[PDB]
């Protein structure tokens, strides 16, 4: 195995070179593959002549671009504010379930909020041991007959931990950090031999500018910080008086012509304070109105000529996006500074001198000089973290994080070297985490700095306000959206997708606006931040809500989820289910199998309801198990035996029923099934004027009711399908509807030029057929999840929780940013 890391420089090579050396990971081999600038090497990683490299924040965006096809996949964890504690969260959850879900796990926390690594489930005696994060280590189950589990202790606070590594078993003349009750660093750090004092934040990130030899004034150490992203700054000497707003004419260095500290950031703010003449590409490019704003500058990758005068490097390396050119990047930016070639550099906090005293200072887009410790209020914004990249194919993922987790633990020296300052890496880098699999440049930077970059690069035209895009997810459905176009009056315009998902990451992604959700996709939708604009209103009894928009709904109408059993069967409750047969319509249906396997799950520690009956009827379960016995088949025998067909007898709403009637003792159905096949509803003979009062519906809480009741004894209601959106566009997607919908909705007043609900391309298209109409979603003050869901829901299939991961994009549209306002 082998991974080539891309350099860009001759300092760079040798310095990963030396790793080759001195790294000793097995199992992975790295070699080191040179080119003469960062495009060059996203070209060599394109083109399969390298694996790897590490990006600014700036070029993670550009090789996103089809050009170079690059992702992020690797960069180092930071953090926003201050967050409660997992197992507290955890806690908090848990207990804002529906209380008619009885005997659900909470966590228990320690005095630290942590879990204790012992963890018991109150109900059912059961505990296991759990990681940091609160899940089980599988197999560690031990049962209330049994003492508790003997767990290993908690993983150490990186400073307990680092403490720990410093000591070393027995030290002397070397730094051990100081760290708080909580394991937290103390704000303030001395070195124990030299004397000298500095401020680091919460997670030990040294403050630069505070770093004091002994003898001197303490530095001021602010409590409590947990804002760890990188800043943007303009860094000046004390020597000079210009403030911000008169940069025009002076000579500048900056980090570089694609970095978005050295770049970005300050021609963000130029142009916002309309310092800089320009607005949008019919002005020319934004590199020539700078080469107008500066009269010299050092802006690496540039090709203005005067943008290119105050660098240094000789011959062909002058001005190159590369280390031989000696003013590249952050602290190339401040060596130009230092050395007189500018008078103001661009870079980021993590580039300023440590040392509190000296003839630095922080220029301020607000016109005023600030200290070095002072970035950030003194700032031209946060940018985001900087990452590894490799081909969006990610042949090479694997070996890439392989090899950097193992050089890490190995201690390596990835992160300094003699040969020069952020070879390979950012010398402040301390560790490097894989990113989330489904992570892209968007959801990496986030959409206000990936709009942001891409604003520089090119008009973007802002779709209208006045028009919803509908995301589609077959041809019919695209048909129909055309024949709703032609009719709408430009209202409505259509998008294509293979999947409801891949709707979900257009409408984030401003390419579409609008999609209906099935239930089993609402909770990954609004994880990554979408909200209902409208639901799917399906009661056919009551059409008040309806004509009279607002008005208010007695019955949603959804069905509910039942458990269905005889009244002759007169020992069965709910909470004794265990062990006995029961019959679910298929594997996958909600509320015949993922309500009634939610709360099995949420009551007995997550054991298979595979295990929890005896023999049962679900068809889709595997032939051979006790899901299938119950099963019969083909009455017209072949074998199609627990098949996702109709040749299973068993199977759909009539067919669970059917099971539970002939052999078992529980049936889970929609609430709709008994009263659909008794009263002599179906001809055949089996349910030959099968009597509707014959049958009763398990409540929660151990008791029963008759069938009339399932309002009231449900295991769960379902929740309409959704119309989500973006937050913005709530407001826009509604109005856009409900004027629709009064055209072409089943009363609409042009309901013959379009119907929204149904087609002849097909069923289903866009809209479920059976719709009444869309009604506004009443967004409560409340946990979305909760509000969309309802508690019984929310509770019985996520356990309340906001953890759960039913679909690998949510790590990535969750991923936090670096962002201003």
């Not at 190339?332 to 630095?360: I, M, W």
């Not at 449900?714 to 409900?738: C, F, H, K, Q, Y």
Request: glycine residues 8%; aromatic residues 8%.
């Amino acid at each position: 195995r082998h991974v080539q890391w891309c350099t860009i420089s001759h300092l760079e090579q040798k310095k990963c070179n030396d790793l080759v050396g001195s790294c000793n990971v097995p199992d992975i081999t790295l070699a080191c593959v040179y080119r003469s600038s960062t495009e060059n090497c996203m070209a060599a990683i394109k083109d399969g002549q390298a694996d790897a490299m590490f990006l600014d924040s700036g070029d993670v965006y550009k090789a996103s671009l089809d050009h170079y096809n690059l992702k992020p996949i690797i960069a180092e964890p930071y953090s926003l504010h201050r967050e409660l504690t997992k197992c507290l969260k955890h806690r908090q959850e848990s207990l804002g379930g529906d209380k008619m879900v009885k005997g659900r796990y909470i966590p228990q926390c320690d005095e630290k909020g942590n879990y204790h690594p012992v963890q018991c489930h109150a109900s059912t005696g059961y505990c296991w041991c759990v990681n940091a994060n609160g899940e089980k280590i599988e197999g560690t189950n031990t049962t209330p007959v049994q003492t508790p589990p003997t767990c290993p202790s908690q993983v150490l606070t990186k400073c307990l931990k680092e403490r720990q590594e410093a000591l070393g078993g027995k030290a002397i003349g070397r730094y051990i950090p100081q760290c708080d009750e909580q394991g937290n660093y103390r704000p303030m750090q001395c070195h124990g031999s030299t004397g000298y004092c500095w401020c680091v934040n919460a997670i030990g990130e040294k403050i630069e500018g505070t770093n004091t030899p002994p003898g001197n004034t303490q530095p001021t150490c602010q409590s409590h910080d947990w804002d760890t992203c990188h800043y943007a700054v303009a860094v000046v000497k004390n020597s000079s008086t210009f403030q911000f707003g008169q940069l025009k004419g002076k000579r500048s260095c900056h980090s570089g012509l694609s970095k978005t500290d050295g770049w970005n950031a300050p021609v963000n703010v130029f142009v916002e304070k309309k310092l800089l003449p320009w607005d949008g590409l019919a002005k020319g490019s934004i590199e020539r109105a700078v080469s107008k704003f500066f009269s010299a500058s050092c802006i690496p990758g540039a090709t203005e000529t005067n943008l290119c005068k105050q660098c240094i490097g000789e011959e062909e390396k002058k001005c190159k996006s590369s280390h031989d050119e000696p003013y590249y990047g952050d602290h190339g930016a401040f060596r130009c500074l230092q050395e007189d070639k500018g008078d103001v550099a661009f870079l980021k906090n993590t580039a300023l001198p440590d040392e509190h005293s000296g003839v630095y200072e922080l220029l301020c887009p607000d016109n005023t000089r600030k200290p070095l410790n002072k970035y950030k209020e003194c700032n031209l914004g946060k940018v985001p973290a900087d990452a590894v990249v490799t081909r969006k194919a990610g042949d090479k993922t694997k070996d890439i994080n392989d090899f950097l987790l193992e050089a890490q633990k190995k201690k390596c020296k990835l992160f300094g070297s003699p040969h020069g300052k952020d070879l390979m890496f950012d010398d402040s880098t301390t560790h490097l985490a894989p990113l989330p699999s489904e992570i892209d440049a968007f959801f990496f930077l986030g959409v206000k700095w990936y709009n942001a970059m891409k604003a520089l690069t090119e008009d973007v035209k802002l779709p209208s306000k006045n028009k919803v895009r509908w995301c589609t997810i077959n041809k019919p459905e695209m048909m129909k959206c055309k024949d709703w176009a032609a009719v709408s009056g430009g209202a409505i315009a259509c998008t294509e997708a293979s999947c409801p998902e891949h709707c979900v990451k257009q409408i984030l992604k401003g390419e579409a606006d609008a999609v209906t959700l099935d239930v089993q996709y609402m909770y990954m939708a609004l994880m990554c931040g979408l909200l209902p604009a409208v639901e799917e209103y399906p009661n056919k009894d009551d059409f008040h809500p309806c004509q009279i928009p607002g008005s208010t709904i007695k019955d949603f109408g959804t069905k509910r989820a039942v458990a269905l059993v005889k009244k002759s069967n007169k020992d069965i409750k709910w909470n004794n289910l265990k062990g006995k047969k029961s019959c679910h319509t298929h594997v996958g249906d909600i509320p015949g199998w993922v309500i009634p396997a939610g709360l099995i799950s949420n009551q007995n520690d997550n054991i298979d309801i595979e295990s929890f009956f005896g023999e049962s009827c679900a068809p889709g379960s595997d032939t051979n198990s006790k899901l299938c016995k119950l099963c019969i088949g083909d009455p017209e025998n072949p074998s199609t035996r627990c098949s996702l067909s109709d040749k299973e007898a068993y199977y759909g709403n009539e067919g669970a029923f059917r099971c539970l009637v002939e052999k078992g003792d529980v049936a889970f159905v929609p609430h709709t099934v008994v009263f659909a096949n008794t009263d002599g509803k179906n001809p055949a003979e089996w349910a030959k004027d099968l009597k509707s009062e014959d049958f009763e519906i398990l409540c929660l809480d151990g008791s029963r009711a008759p069938v009339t009741n399932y309002r009231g004894c449900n295991l769960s209601g379902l929740p309409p399908r959704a119309i989500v959106t973006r937050e913005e566009s709530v407001s826009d997607v509604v109005r856009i509807l409900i004027n629709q919908q009064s055209l072409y909705g089943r009363n609409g007043f042009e309901k013959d030029m379009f119907q929204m609900f149904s087609s002849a391309k097909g069923q289903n298209l866009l809209f479920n057929d059976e719709t009444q109409c869309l009604i506004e979603f009443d967004r409560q003050p409340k946990d979305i999840m909760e509000d969309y869901f309802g508690v019984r829901y929310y509770t019985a299939v996520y356990s309340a929780s906001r953890s759960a991961v039913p679909s690998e994009l949510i790590p990535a549209c969750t991923f936090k940013h670096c962002s201003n306002s």
